[PDB]
Amino acid sequence: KPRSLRFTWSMKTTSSMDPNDMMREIRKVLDANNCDYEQKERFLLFCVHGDARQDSLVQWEMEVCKLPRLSLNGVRFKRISGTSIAFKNIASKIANELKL
Ligand SMILES: [Cl-]
Ligand SMILES: [Cl-]
């Protein structure tokens, strides 16, 4: 089951979709944007975009979670590495393209 998490201002991606369907959509959008992901847990991805030999390498977590206090599911994003601008750019693009 996805983890149950407290709603915070960072949570901007919510959905009533089945969490497994959410994961399918997330991987689809990541593929479309040439982001790699490691399947850390059923509902947790370690994502990577860009080129380590340039200035563009960005790593971040994406997690599908339940938000019981909203009766919704959500997608958590958290930076792991990379410049602030590179993270803002790629993570915002992914978030904008998710069809949940
Ligand atoms: Cl908050
Ligand atoms: Cl979040």
XYZ file of all heavy atoms in Angstrom, unseen atoms left out:
806
model
N 0.862 -1.216 0.000
C 0.000 0.000 0.000
C 0.881 1.242 0.000
O 1.970 1.213 0.567
C -0.898 0.020 1.240
N 0.418 2.338 -0.640
C 1.180 3.579 -0.533
C 1.169 4.086 0.904
O 0.195 3.847 1.640
C 0.396 4.556 -1.411
C -0.403 3.700 -2.324
C -0.750 2.492 -1.524
N 2.238 4.772 1.297
C 2.307 5.408 2.609
C 1.216 6.455 2.746
O 0.894 7.142 1.779
C 3.646 6.124 2.793
C 4.855 5.246 3.034
C 5.952 6.055 3.733
N 6.334 7.260 2.991
C 7.032 8.275 3.493
N 7.413 8.261 4.771
N 7.330 9.322 2.723
N 0.666 6.588 3.953
C -0.259 7.686 4.252
C 0.526 8.886 4.745
O 1.308 8.786 5.704
C -1.319 7.257 5.281
O -2.189 6.298 4.701
N 0.324 10.025 4.089
C 1.112 11.206 4.421
C 0.255 12.413 4.738
O -0.875 12.542 4.264
C 2.110 11.529 3.305
C 3.099 10.417 2.948
C 3.937 10.825 1.746
C 3.981 10.037 4.124
N 0.804 13.281 5.590
C 0.192 14.557 5.944
C 0.304 15.562 4.804
O 1.386 15.745 4.228
C 0.878 15.109 7.196
C 0.559 16.553 7.540
C 1.024 16.831 8.967
N 1.567 18.171 9.133
C 0.829 19.255 9.324
N -0.491 19.153 9.374
N 1.407 20.435 9.466
N -0.818 16.198 4.470
C -0.832 17.226 3.460
C -0.020 18.434 3.920
O -0.219 18.970 5.021
C -2.257 17.664 3.152
C -2.321 18.766 2.142
C -2.143 18.494 0.793
C -2.501 20.080 2.547
C -2.175 19.505 -0.149
C -2.531 21.108 1.616
C -2.367 20.818 0.257
N 0.889 18.860 3.052
C 1.660 20.071 3.275
C 1.617 20.884 1.990
O 1.159 20.411 0.942
C 3.137 19.768 3.643
O 3.770 19.083 2.562
C 3.229 18.927 4.944
N 2.093 22.120 2.076
C 1.993 23.040 0.955
C 2.727 22.510 -0.288
O 2.346 22.822 -1.428
C 2.533 24.406 1.397
C 2.475 25.449 0.353
C 3.540 26.113 -0.193
C 1.304 25.969 -0.285
N 3.100 27.009 -1.129
C 1.735 26.941 -1.214
C -0.068 25.704 -0.169
C 0.843 27.663 -2.018
C -0.956 26.423 -0.975
C -0.496 27.385 -1.885
N 3.743 21.687 -0.067
C 4.488 21.078 -1.169
C 3.641 20.161 -2.043
O 3.939 19.989 -3.230
C 5.691 20.327 -0.636
O 5.289 19.309 0.240
N 2.585 19.583 -1.465
C 1.713 18.655 -2.198
C 0.794 19.389 -3.174
O -0.226 19.956 -2.784
C 0.900 17.799 -1.213
C -0.075 16.823 -1.874
S 0.719 15.711 -3.069
C 1.866 14.825 -2.007
N 1.173 19.380 -4.452
C 0.459 20.118 -5.489
C -0.083 19.192 -6.561
O -0.664 19.648 -7.533
C 1.420 21.115 -6.147
C 2.892 20.702 -6.056
C 3.277 19.572 -7.050
C 3.082 18.098 -6.569
N 3.590 17.548 -5.291
N 0.134 17.891 -6.390
C -0.282 16.910 -7.389
C -1.152 15.862 -6.720
O -0.644 14.917 -6.152
C 0.943 16.215 -8.017
O 1.867 17.209 -8.481
C 0.545 15.340 -9.184
N -2.465 16.047 -6.775
C -3.367 15.090 -6.148
C -4.236 14.415 -7.196
O -4.379 14.920 -8.321
C -4.258 15.743 -5.067
O -5.076 16.763 -5.664
C -3.403 16.348 -3.952
N -4.815 13.280 -6.821
C -5.546 12.443 -7.764
C -6.463 11.492 -7.023
O -6.157 11.075 -5.917
C -4.560 11.637 -8.607
O -5.227 10.873 -9.589
N -7.585 11.142 -7.644
C -8.408 10.053 -7.133
C -8.147 8.736 -7.885
O -8.829 7.737 -7.647
C -9.888 10.434 -7.197
O -10.241 10.756 -8.523
N -7.159 8.740 -8.784
C -6.771 7.557 -9.551
C -6.201 6.459 -8.639
O -5.595 6.753 -7.608
C -5.755 7.980 -10.627
C -5.288 6.915 -11.598
S -4.075 7.548 -12.791
C -5.151 8.364 -13.972
N -6.391 5.201 -9.027
C -5.768 4.068 -8.343
C -4.245 4.282 -8.306
O -3.669 4.682 -9.313
C -6.094 2.781 -9.093
C -5.483 1.555 -8.446
O -4.294 1.259 -8.710
O -6.188 0.883 -7.659
N -3.600 4.039 -7.152
C -2.152 4.319 -7.056
C -1.292 3.584 -8.090
O -0.268 4.119 -8.540
C -1.799 3.849 -5.649
C -3.094 4.055 -4.875
C -4.172 3.665 -5.842
N -1.686 2.373 -8.462
C -0.934 1.651 -9.494
C -1.082 2.299 -10.862
O -0.123 2.346 -11.635
C -1.316 0.165 -9.521
C -0.935 -0.552 -8.240
O -1.805 -0.968 -7.471
N 0.356 -0.671 -7.981
N -2.266 2.826 -11.154
C -2.481 3.587 -12.381
C -1.678 4.889 -12.357
O -1.141 5.324 -13.388
C -3.971 3.860 -12.594
C -4.739 2.614 -13.031
O -4.131 1.723 -13.656
O -5.957 2.535 -12.747
N -1.574 5.495 -11.172
C -0.743 6.690 -11.013
C 0.717 6.388 -11.350
O 1.368 7.185 -12.030
C -0.867 7.269 -9.605
C -2.257 7.838 -9.326
S -2.491 8.314 -7.595
C -1.250 9.611 -7.456
N 1.229 5.264 -10.852
C 2.632 4.875 -11.108
C 2.855 4.658 -12.606
O 3.887 5.051 -13.147
C 3.017 3.615 -10.330
C 3.101 3.795 -8.805
S 4.310 5.055 -8.321
C 5.865 4.241 -8.724
N 1.876 4.043 -13.273
C 1.978 3.835 -14.726
C 2.086 5.168 -15.466
O 2.909 5.316 -16.374
C 0.793 3.014 -15.245
C 0.879 2.669 -16.727
N 1.268 6.138 -15.065
C 1.276 7.458 -15.676
C 2.601 8.186 -15.409
O 3.175 8.802 -16.307
C 0.083 8.291 -15.186
C 0.065 9.760 -15.666
C -0.040 9.955 -17.177
O -0.363 8.991 -17.921
O 0.180 11.105 -17.623
N 3.075 8.095 -14.174
C 4.349 8.711 -13.818
C 5.495 8.156 -14.675
O 6.270 8.931 -15.249
C 4.635 8.562 -12.318
C 3.658 9.440 -11.527
C 6.097 8.938 -12.019
C 3.548 9.016 -10.042
N 5.609 6.833 -14.762
C 6.688 6.236 -15.575
C 6.575 6.651 -17.050
O 7.586 6.884 -17.711
C 6.732 4.710 -15.405
C 7.237 4.297 -14.004
C 7.459 2.759 -13.865
N 6.165 2.096 -13.915
C 5.491 1.644 -12.862
N 6.012 1.667 -11.626
N 4.304 1.107 -13.064
N 5.347 6.774 -17.541
C 5.104 7.199 -18.928
C 5.629 8.619 -19.187
O 6.342 8.864 -20.172
C 3.610 7.075 -19.263
C 3.207 7.645 -20.616
C 1.730 7.397 -20.897
C 1.333 7.978 -22.251
N -0.054 7.557 -22.630
N 5.309 9.540 -18.273
C 5.742 10.922 -18.405
C 7.263 11.014 -18.219
O 7.923 11.767 -18.927
C 4.948 11.834 -17.443
C 5.519 13.270 -17.433
C 3.475 11.847 -17.849
N 7.819 10.244 -17.285
C 9.276 10.227 -17.114
C 9.981 9.731 -18.387
O 10.938 10.364 -18.859
C 9.678 9.409 -15.889
C 9.302 10.020 -14.532
C 9.449 8.964 -13.440
C 10.193 11.226 -14.231
N 9.484 8.630 -18.959
C 10.019 8.122 -20.244
C 9.994 9.198 -21.332
O 10.988 9.391 -22.047
C 9.199 6.924 -20.749
C 9.402 5.663 -19.932
O 10.290 5.614 -19.049
O 8.635 4.697 -20.178
N 8.861 9.905 -21.445
C 8.663 10.920 -22.478
C 9.626 12.078 -22.331
O 9.926 12.758 -23.305
C 7.226 11.427 -22.456
N 10.113 12.297 -21.107
C 11.066 13.365 -20.819
C 12.507 12.890 -20.636
O 13.365 13.637 -20.151
C 10.589 14.134 -19.582
C 9.441 15.057 -19.906
O 9.665 16.177 -20.355
N 8.199 14.588 -19.709
N 12.779 11.661 -21.069
C 14.105 11.053 -20.916
C 14.644 11.147 -19.492
O 15.803 11.516 -19.271
C 15.112 11.629 -21.909
C 16.374 10.791 -21.999
O 16.369 9.596 -21.667
N 17.451 11.399 -22.474
N 13.785 10.829 -18.534
C 14.205 10.680 -17.148
C 14.301 9.193 -16.863
O 13.367 8.445 -17.173
C 13.162 11.278 -16.217
S 12.913 13.039 -16.440
N 15.426 8.761 -16.303
C 15.539 7.393 -15.791
C 14.903 7.358 -14.408
O 14.855 8.376 -13.711
C 17.005 6.978 -15.643
C 17.730 6.803 -16.980
O 17.071 6.531 -18.003
O 18.969 6.902 -16.971
N 14.453 6.178 -13.990
C 13.971 5.989 -12.616
C 14.391 4.617 -12.120
O 14.317 3.637 -12.859
C 12.438 6.148 -12.506
C 11.709 5.530 -13.676
C 11.318 4.180 -13.657
C 11.454 6.279 -14.823
C 10.673 3.606 -14.772
C 10.802 5.717 -15.926
C 10.421 4.389 -15.888
O 9.810 3.853 -17.004
N 14.848 4.565 -10.876
C 15.058 3.296 -10.178
C 13.810 3.001 -9.356
O 13.288 3.873 -8.653
C 16.289 3.394 -9.269
C 17.603 3.659 -10.051
C 18.703 4.277 -9.189
O 18.761 3.955 -7.983
O 19.518 5.076 -9.717
N 13.330 1.762 -9.443
C 12.148 1.351 -8.705
C 12.555 0.966 -7.275
O 12.891 -0.187 -6.990
C 11.460 0.205 -9.456
C 10.034 -0.091 -9.010
C 9.001 0.920 -9.494
O 8.832 1.160 -10.698
N 8.272 1.493 -8.546
N 12.577 1.957 -6.390
C 13.077 1.765 -5.023
C 12.110 0.945 -4.181
O 12.521 0.064 -3.402
C 13.343 3.116 -4.353
C 14.588 3.824 -4.881
C 15.850 3.126 -4.387
C 17.074 3.567 -5.149
N 18.332 3.041 -4.513
N 10.832 1.283 -4.307
C 9.730 0.528 -3.706
C 8.593 0.528 -4.709
O 8.680 1.193 -5.740
C 9.264 1.175 -2.404
C 10.348 1.344 -1.346
C 9.948 2.306 -0.242
O 8.781 2.777 -0.241
O 10.813 2.605 0.620
N 7.508 -0.188 -4.410
C 6.395 -0.219 -5.349
C 5.912 1.196 -5.686
O 5.560 1.461 -6.830
C 5.231 -1.057 -4.819
C 4.076 -1.135 -5.796
C 2.921 -1.937 -5.214
N 3.129 -3.358 -5.428
C 2.620 -4.043 -6.447
N 1.853 -3.434 -7.349
N 2.883 -5.339 -6.558
N 5.928 2.097 -4.701
C 5.391 3.435 -4.922
C 6.427 4.543 -4.790
O 6.068 5.711 -4.609
C 4.191 3.671 -4.001
C 3.048 2.746 -4.288
C 2.757 1.698 -3.430
C 2.283 2.914 -5.434
C 1.694 0.831 -3.720
C 1.228 2.051 -5.724
C 0.940 1.016 -4.870
N 7.707 4.190 -4.912
C 8.776 5.180 -4.759
C 9.804 5.041 -5.869
O 10.369 3.962 -6.075
C 9.483 5.024 -3.398
C 10.679 5.926 -3.080
C 10.223 7.380 -2.911
C 11.362 5.422 -1.812
N 10.053 6.150 -6.553
C 11.043 6.176 -7.623
C 12.148 7.144 -7.287
O 11.892 8.234 -6.784
C 10.406 6.644 -8.930
C 9.208 5.843 -9.454
C 8.625 6.530 -10.709
C 9.636 4.391 -9.744
N 13.375 6.728 -7.595
C 14.570 7.615 -7.562
C 14.809 7.991 -9.019
O 15.177 7.147 -9.846
C 15.806 6.904 -6.927
C 17.110 7.738 -6.883
C 17.461 8.456 -5.730
C 18.007 7.722 -7.955
C 18.652 9.184 -5.679
C 19.194 8.456 -7.906
C 19.512 9.179 -6.759
N 14.581 9.264 -9.338
C 14.598 9.738 -10.726
C 15.861 10.497 -11.043
O 16.433 11.154 -10.177
C 13.415 10.677 -10.967
S 11.828 9.946 -10.562
N 16.285 10.408 -12.299
C 17.517 11.057 -12.763
C 17.299 11.669 -14.155
O 16.759 11.001 -15.037
C 18.701 10.036 -12.838
C 20.020 10.751 -13.122
C 18.813 9.209 -11.549
N 17.722 12.913 -14.349
C 17.657 13.551 -15.647
C 18.962 14.283 -15.919
O 19.637 14.732 -15.001
C 16.476 14.543 -15.667
C 16.247 15.184 -16.993
N 16.713 16.442 -17.298
C 15.578 14.749 -18.090
C 16.352 16.752 -18.533
N 15.664 15.746 -19.035
N 19.321 14.384 -17.192
C 20.482 15.197 -17.587
C 21.773 14.410 -17.675
O 21.782 13.186 -17.642
N 22.878 15.140 -17.784
C 24.158 14.537 -18.126
C 25.156 14.901 -17.052
O 25.419 16.079 -16.827
C 24.615 15.060 -19.489
C 25.897 14.388 -19.991
O 26.656 13.812 -19.185
O 26.131 14.430 -21.222
N 25.708 13.880 -16.398
C 26.654 14.069 -15.314
C 27.910 14.811 -15.763
O 28.554 15.485 -14.957
C 27.013 12.726 -14.669
N 28.247 14.715 -17.050
C 29.423 15.416 -17.584
C 29.139 16.879 -17.930
O 30.055 17.635 -18.286
C 30.025 14.670 -18.787
C 30.257 13.183 -18.585
C 31.557 12.839 -17.842
N 31.549 13.269 -16.436
C 30.956 12.620 -15.431
N 30.285 11.489 -15.642
N 31.029 13.118 -14.196
N 27.876 17.287 -17.823
C 27.495 18.692 -17.990
C 27.012 19.259 -16.655
O 27.356 18.725 -15.599
C 26.433 18.857 -19.091
C 26.770 18.190 -20.446
C 28.080 18.686 -21.061
O 28.794 17.925 -21.726
N 28.402 19.961 -20.837
N 26.194 20.309 -16.701
C 25.716 20.972 -15.481
C 24.279 20.592 -15.175
O 23.634 21.193 -14.313
C 25.827 22.501 -15.628
C 25.037 23.056 -16.839
O 24.411 22.283 -17.605
O 25.055 24.290 -17.044
N 23.793 19.572 -15.875
C 22.369 19.339 -15.982
C 21.896 18.161 -15.153
O 20.696 17.893 -15.136
C 22.005 19.099 -17.449
O 22.812 18.058 -18.004
N 22.814 17.472 -14.460
C 22.407 16.244 -13.728
C 21.522 16.589 -12.528
O 21.946 17.324 -11.650
C 23.606 15.408 -13.251
C 23.169 14.031 -12.720
C 22.761 13.129 -13.905
C 24.231 13.356 -11.883
N 20.311 16.037 -12.504
C 19.353 16.272 -11.407
C 18.835 14.927 -10.924
O 18.473 14.075 -11.730
C 18.134 17.114 -11.862
C 17.132 17.290 -10.695
C 18.555 18.467 -12.358
N 18.826 14.724 -9.606
C 18.235 13.521 -9.033
C 17.126 13.955 -8.071
O 17.271 14.953 -7.367
C 19.287 12.720 -8.271
C 20.426 12.232 -9.166
C 21.590 11.687 -8.372
O 22.022 12.280 -7.387
N 22.095 10.525 -8.786
N 16.018 13.213 -8.047
C 14.914 13.535 -7.138
C 14.054 12.316 -6.876
O 14.048 11.371 -7.667
C 14.055 14.703 -7.658
C 13.166 14.413 -8.844
C 11.807 14.231 -8.820
C 13.557 14.314 -10.216
N 11.330 14.023 -10.094
C 12.388 14.058 -10.965
C 14.793 14.403 -10.889
C 12.413 13.884 -12.354
C 14.814 14.233 -12.273
C 13.634 13.984 -12.983
N 13.341 12.342 -5.754
C 12.394 11.270 -5.408
C 11.008 11.648 -5.888
O 10.624 12.822 -5.850
C 12.291 11.090 -3.887
C 13.567 10.694 -3.204
C 13.407 10.535 -1.692
O 12.301 10.785 -1.159
O 14.408 10.176 -1.038
N 10.264 10.648 -6.355
C 8.825 10.795 -6.576
C 8.142 9.653 -5.852
O 8.566 8.509 -5.954
C 8.468 10.771 -8.068
C 9.003 11.976 -8.843
S 8.499 11.939 -10.586
C 6.720 12.209 -10.452
N 7.103 9.962 -5.088
C 6.431 8.924 -4.324
C 4.926 9.094 -4.454
O 4.420 10.190 -4.295
C 6.833 9.015 -2.841
C 6.247 7.875 -2.005
C 6.567 7.958 -0.517
O 7.219 8.928 -0.072
O 6.154 7.023 0.209
N 4.210 8.009 -4.741
C 2.735 8.043 -4.708
C 2.324 7.716 -3.278
O 2.795 6.729 -2.708
C 2.121 7.051 -5.727
C 0.624 6.790 -5.438
C 2.291 7.610 -7.133
N 1.441 8.541 -2.718
C 1.029 8.414 -1.322
C -0.466 8.622 -1.182
O -1.094 9.238 -2.046
C 1.742 9.457 -0.469
S 1.320 11.152 -0.932
N -1.022 8.127 -0.077
C -2.426 8.399 0.260
C -2.431 9.673 1.075
O -1.517 9.915 1.861
C -3.033 7.295 1.146
C -2.881 5.886 0.636
C -3.629 5.683 -0.649
C -5.090 5.300 -0.441
N -5.670 5.048 -1.791
N -3.463 10.480 0.876
C -3.683 11.686 1.677
C -5.059 11.558 2.348
O -6.039 12.152 1.881
C -3.629 12.926 0.779
C -2.286 13.166 0.074
C -2.454 14.184 -1.060
C -1.262 13.654 1.066
N -5.134 10.780 3.446
C -6.456 10.438 4.009
C -7.279 11.660 4.414
O -8.502 11.648 4.271
C -6.113 9.605 5.245
C -4.727 9.077 4.993
C -4.027 10.091 4.139
N -6.622 12.718 4.887
C -7.336 13.927 5.308
C -7.964 14.715 4.155
O -8.784 15.610 4.386
C -6.455 14.822 6.204
C -5.906 14.147 7.483
C -6.841 14.313 8.718
N -8.175 13.805 8.453
C -9.269 14.545 8.242
N -9.251 15.879 8.322
N -10.411 13.935 7.943
N -7.583 14.379 2.914
C -8.220 14.957 1.713
C -9.061 13.950 0.933
O -9.649 14.306 -0.090
C -7.154 15.505 0.759
C -6.286 16.668 1.225
C -5.299 16.996 0.113
C -7.113 17.897 1.558
N -9.078 12.697 1.390
C -9.685 11.579 0.647
C -9.147 11.493 -0.778
O -9.897 11.250 -1.726
C -11.223 11.690 0.623
O -11.713 11.808 1.949
N -7.843 11.701 -0.918
C -7.190 11.692 -2.237
C -5.851 10.997 -2.121
O -5.398 10.720 -1.014
C -6.963 13.121 -2.742
C -8.179 13.942 -3.184
C -7.792 15.386 -3.409
C -8.817 13.314 -4.439
N -5.252 10.698 -3.275
C -3.859 10.284 -3.375
C -3.028 11.467 -3.841
O -3.565 12.458 -4.348
C -3.704 9.131 -4.376
C -4.542 7.938 -4.013
O -5.171 7.304 -4.875
N -4.575 7.628 -2.745
N -1.714 11.370 -3.690
C -0.846 12.478 -4.096
C 0.469 11.982 -4.658
O 0.814 10.804 -4.504
N 1.213 12.893 -5.274
C 2.563 12.570 -5.756
C 3.522 13.532 -5.088
O 3.452 14.740 -5.329
C 2.692 12.690 -7.284
C 4.118 12.259 -7.731
C 1.654 11.809 -7.977
N 4.389 12.987 -4.237
C 5.414 13.751 -3.532
C 6.658 13.881 -4.416
O 7.058 12.912 -5.036
C 5.752 13.033 -2.218
C 6.818 13.733 -1.355
C 7.089 12.980 -0.040
N 7.763 11.705 -0.262
C 9.077 11.567 -0.440
N 9.876 12.628 -0.404
N 9.592 10.363 -0.649
N 7.256 15.074 -4.475
C 8.542 15.289 -5.150
C 9.542 15.773 -4.098
O 9.194 16.601 -3.239
C 8.471 16.398 -6.205
C 7.679 16.085 -7.439
C 6.286 15.989 -7.408
C 8.325 16.007 -8.669
C 5.545 15.756 -8.595
C 7.606 15.769 -9.855
C 6.202 15.643 -9.810
N 10.786 15.299 -4.161
C 11.832 15.829 -3.282
C 13.206 15.815 -3.946
O 13.644 14.784 -4.427
C 11.901 15.029 -1.979
C 12.899 15.617 -0.981
C 13.007 14.742 0.250
C 13.884 15.415 1.298
N 13.869 14.641 2.564
N 13.881 16.965 -3.951
C 15.211 17.019 -4.557
C 16.215 16.144 -3.789
O 16.204 16.043 -2.543
C 15.709 18.474 -4.751
C 17.099 18.576 -5.407
C 17.504 20.006 -5.777
N 17.295 20.982 -4.708
C 18.107 22.013 -4.473
N 19.197 22.189 -5.216
N 17.842 22.870 -3.490
N 17.069 15.487 -4.568
C 18.180 14.727 -4.008
C 19.498 15.395 -4.390
O 20.358 15.577 -3.533
C 18.149 13.250 -4.430
C 16.878 12.592 -3.900
C 19.350 12.501 -3.871
C 16.800 12.584 -2.393
N 19.654 15.764 -5.662
C 20.859 16.511 -6.083
C 20.570 17.348 -7.313
O 19.508 17.204 -7.946
C 22.050 15.573 -6.379
O 21.855 14.862 -7.606
N 21.534 18.217 -7.649
C 21.420 19.078 -8.824
C 21.214 20.531 -8.448
O 20.887 20.848 -7.291
N 21.387 21.417 -9.421
C 21.175 22.839 -9.149
C 19.694 23.115 -8.900
O 18.813 22.343 -9.319
C 21.693 23.730 -10.280
O 20.920 23.487 -11.464
C 23.161 23.403 -10.551
N 19.432 24.205 -8.183
C 18.061 24.606 -7.883
C 17.261 24.848 -9.171
O 16.111 24.404 -9.295
C 18.072 25.837 -6.976
O 18.581 25.497 -5.694
N 17.889 25.512 -10.144
C 17.209 25.808 -11.404
C 16.956 24.536 -12.213
O 15.866 24.351 -12.764
C 17.945 26.902 -12.237
C 17.076 27.353 -13.412
C 19.297 26.408 -12.763
C 15.816 28.075 -12.987
N 17.947 23.645 -12.275
C 17.776 22.421 -13.052
C 16.654 21.565 -12.462
O 15.826 21.006 -13.203
C 19.099 21.642 -13.155
N 16.584 21.507 -11.131
C 15.516 20.763 -10.469
C 14.160 21.422 -10.709
O 13.198 20.758 -11.069
C 15.770 20.597 -8.959
C 14.578 20.055 -8.211
C 14.198 18.723 -8.358
C 13.808 20.887 -7.395
C 13.086 18.200 -7.680
C 12.674 20.379 -6.713
C 12.310 19.037 -6.858
N 14.080 22.733 -10.507
C 12.827 23.447 -10.721
C 12.311 23.200 -12.135
O 11.132 22.911 -12.335
C 13.029 24.948 -10.485
C 11.751 25.770 -10.588
C 12.084 27.257 -10.402
C 10.838 28.137 -10.465
N 10.272 28.243 -11.837
N 13.198 23.296 -13.115
C 12.796 23.125 -14.506
C 12.255 21.730 -14.818
O 11.162 21.605 -15.388
C 13.943 23.464 -15.448
C 14.201 24.965 -15.555
O 15.254 25.380 -16.040
N 13.262 25.773 -15.097
N 12.997 20.685 -14.458
C 12.558 19.328 -14.843
C 11.367 18.857 -14.015
O 10.387 18.348 -14.552
C 13.729 18.260 -14.902
C 13.239 16.931 -15.499
C 14.326 17.998 -13.530
C 12.702 17.043 -16.927
N 11.415 19.083 -12.708
C 10.325 18.641 -11.841
C 9.010 19.340 -12.195
O 7.949 18.713 -12.213
C 10.684 18.851 -10.362
N 9.081 20.634 -12.494
C 7.883 21.376 -12.909
C 7.318 20.858 -14.226
O 6.094 20.757 -14.380
C 8.178 22.868 -13.007
O 8.551 23.359 -11.732
N 8.193 20.523 -15.170
C 7.750 19.961 -16.445
C 7.017 18.634 -16.246
O 5.937 18.423 -16.812
C 8.919 19.797 -17.426
C 8.452 19.509 -18.859
C 9.604 19.568 -19.843
C 9.115 19.495 -21.306
N 8.401 18.235 -21.680
N 7.598 17.747 -15.441
C 6.972 16.455 -15.149
C 5.611 16.677 -14.484
O 4.600 16.093 -14.905
C 7.867 15.556 -14.230
C 9.205 15.241 -14.900
C 7.140 14.273 -13.821
C 9.096 14.459 -16.211
N 5.582 17.517 -13.449
C 4.334 17.765 -12.708
C 3.234 18.312 -13.621
O 2.066 17.893 -13.520
C 4.573 18.709 -11.534
N 3.613 19.209 -14.526
C 2.653 19.823 -15.450
C 2.084 18.835 -16.460
O 0.960 19.007 -16.924
C 3.287 20.995 -16.182
C 3.513 22.192 -15.277
O 2.925 22.297 -14.201
N 4.379 23.099 -15.708
N 2.850 17.795 -16.774
C 2.456 16.832 -17.808
C 1.716 15.601 -17.284
O 1.139 14.836 -18.076
C 3.667 16.422 -18.634
C 4.132 17.545 -19.518
C 5.372 17.232 -20.308
O 5.765 16.044 -20.413
O 5.943 18.208 -20.846
N 1.700 15.411 -15.964
C 1.018 14.252 -15.386
C -0.482 14.371 -15.615
O -1.071 15.420 -15.337
C 1.332 14.119 -13.888
C 2.772 13.726 -13.546
C 3.000 13.820 -12.049
C 3.088 12.329 -14.035
N -1.079 13.315 -16.165
C -2.523 13.273 -16.392
C -3.113 12.307 -15.384
O -3.182 11.094 -15.619
C -2.850 12.832 -17.827
C -2.159 13.652 -18.915
C -2.505 15.134 -18.851
N -3.519 12.856 -14.245
C -3.972 12.033 -13.133
C -5.447 12.331 -12.797
O -6.185 12.866 -13.635
C -3.059 12.243 -11.915
C -1.557 11.991 -12.111
C -0.767 12.516 -10.916
C -1.282 10.525 -12.325
Cl 2.561 23.250 5.104
Cl 5.325 17.013 -2.191
